Amino acid sequence: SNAMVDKRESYTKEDLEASGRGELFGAGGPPLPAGNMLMMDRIVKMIEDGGSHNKGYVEAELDINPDLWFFGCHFIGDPVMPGCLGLDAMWQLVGFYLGWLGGEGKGRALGVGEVKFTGQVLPDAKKVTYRINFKRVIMRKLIMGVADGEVLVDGKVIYTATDLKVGLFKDTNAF
Amino acid sequence: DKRESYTKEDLEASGRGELFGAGGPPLPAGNMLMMDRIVKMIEDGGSHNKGYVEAELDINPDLWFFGCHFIGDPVMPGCLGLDAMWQLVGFYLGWLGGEGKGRALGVGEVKFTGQVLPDAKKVTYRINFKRVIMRKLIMGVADGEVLVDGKVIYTATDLKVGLFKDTF
Numbered sequence: 001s002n003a004m005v006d007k008r009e010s011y012t013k014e015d016l017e018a019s020g021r022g023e024l025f026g027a028g029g030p031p032l033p034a035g036n037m038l039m040m041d042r043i044v045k046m047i048e049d050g051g052s053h054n055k056g057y058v059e060a061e062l063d064i065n066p067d068l069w070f071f072g073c074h075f076i077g078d079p080v081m082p083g084c085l086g087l088d089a090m091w092q093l094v095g096f097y098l099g100w101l102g103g104e105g106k107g108r109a110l111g112v113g114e115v116k117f118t119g120q121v122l123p124d125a126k127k128v129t130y131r132i133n134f135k136r137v138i139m140r141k142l143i144m145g146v147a148d149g150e151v152l153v154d155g156k157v158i159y160t161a162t163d164l165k166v167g168l169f170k171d172t173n174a175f
Numbered sequence: 176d177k178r179e180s181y182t183k184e185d186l187e188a189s190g191r192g193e194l195f196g197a198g199g200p201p202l203p204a205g206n207m208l209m210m211d212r213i214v215k216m217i218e219d220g221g222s223h224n225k226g227y228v229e230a231e232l233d234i235n236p237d238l239w240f241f242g243c244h245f246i247g248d249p250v251m252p253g254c255l256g257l258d259a260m261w262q263l264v265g266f267y268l269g270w271l272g273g274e275g276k277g278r279a280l281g282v283g284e285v286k287f288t289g290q291v292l293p294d295a296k297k298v299t300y301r302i303n304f305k306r307v308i309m310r311k312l313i314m315g316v317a318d319g320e321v322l323v324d325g326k327v328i329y330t331a332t333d334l335k336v337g338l339f340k341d342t343f
Contacts (some may be wrong), residue, residue, distance in 0.1 A: 020245070031245045034243045035205070037243045037244040038243070050337065054207030070206075070253075073208075074206070074207040075277070076192065079275050082207060082258060083258075083261075088252055088254035104304065107245075108250075108290065109254070110254055111285040112285045113283075113284055114284070115319075116280070116281040117279055119343060120343055
């Protein structure tokens with residue numbers, strides 16, 4: 001277990017940038033992506049016994065403005081946030097939760113069971129919210145999380161994902 | 176009468192809405208484009224006899240995502256290989272002549288069982304259509320595989336993409 005976790009109920013943008021550098025959880029813990037792969041600006045809630053299965057609830061936010069890098073290239077003439085990046089935000093939060101519980105290793109998304117898109121994030125939106133309900137959390141020799149997730153734009157559910165799966169790996173030589 | 180392969184220049188023209196008709200769905204441009212070439216397109220080809228696309232992405236250590244995902248541990252985001260598969264499903268719908276704005280509508284089971292590191296050489300995408308539906312919404316359903324240097328590393332079942340006359 002990684003005893004160096006700065007374990008709090010919420011995290012700021014500075015915390016998320018520190019995580020990208022490996023500083024928030026310390027040397028052993030999984031970093032978030034940095035730069036243009038970081039898909040949120042804050043984590044508003046982390047509740048270890050919360051959510052649908054009483055195994056974890058995580059809520060995070062991404063602030064929207066028209067200049068975010070992905071709007072200009074996806075697509076020319078038709079800006080819209082890539083659904084794959086909202087899905088990645090949820091994978092990143094699953095791995096972050098495993099690190100928050102003291103899990104050590106590199107994060108690797110393992111997949112998802114089903115994703116349904118029913119709406120979109122346009123450049124005139126204001127806020128994307130990610131809500132993660134953890135269903136299975138293994139914190140042993142194997143470190144893995146299984147969760148369901150939703151993406152909201154300005155309070156409206158637009159993506160659902162069931163069976164998001166992420167593991168932490170001291171070594172990725174099996175990949 | 177349709178071409179069966181497309182070059183990087185063609186894919187960049189697609190991003191500008193300039194490969195097919197003005198109404199055809201553009202590929203992503205810039206950093207969101209996840210392919211260098213389409214090597215094969217077969218109408219009613221592939222594993223279900225309903226359509227096939229094969230495409231490639233050349234790997235080098237300077238691809239933008241390596242530097243930020245993750246610091247100290249460069250690896251291609253699985254989500255971007257998944258997006259390439261959605262991109263190719265929508266591209267096939269436009270290749271058939273479908274018009275509209277492309278939107279991923281969902282996917283069934285996705286498995287990431289291997290990884291793309293900066294020392295890899297080539298990623299291959301293989302898309303096997305199961306259904307093409309030409310209605311007010313044009314929809315494509317397909318299974319997909321991603322390979323790195325000959326090894327299957329990602330799979331996706333029931334990729335679904337729509338072409339919308341208007342947006343959802």
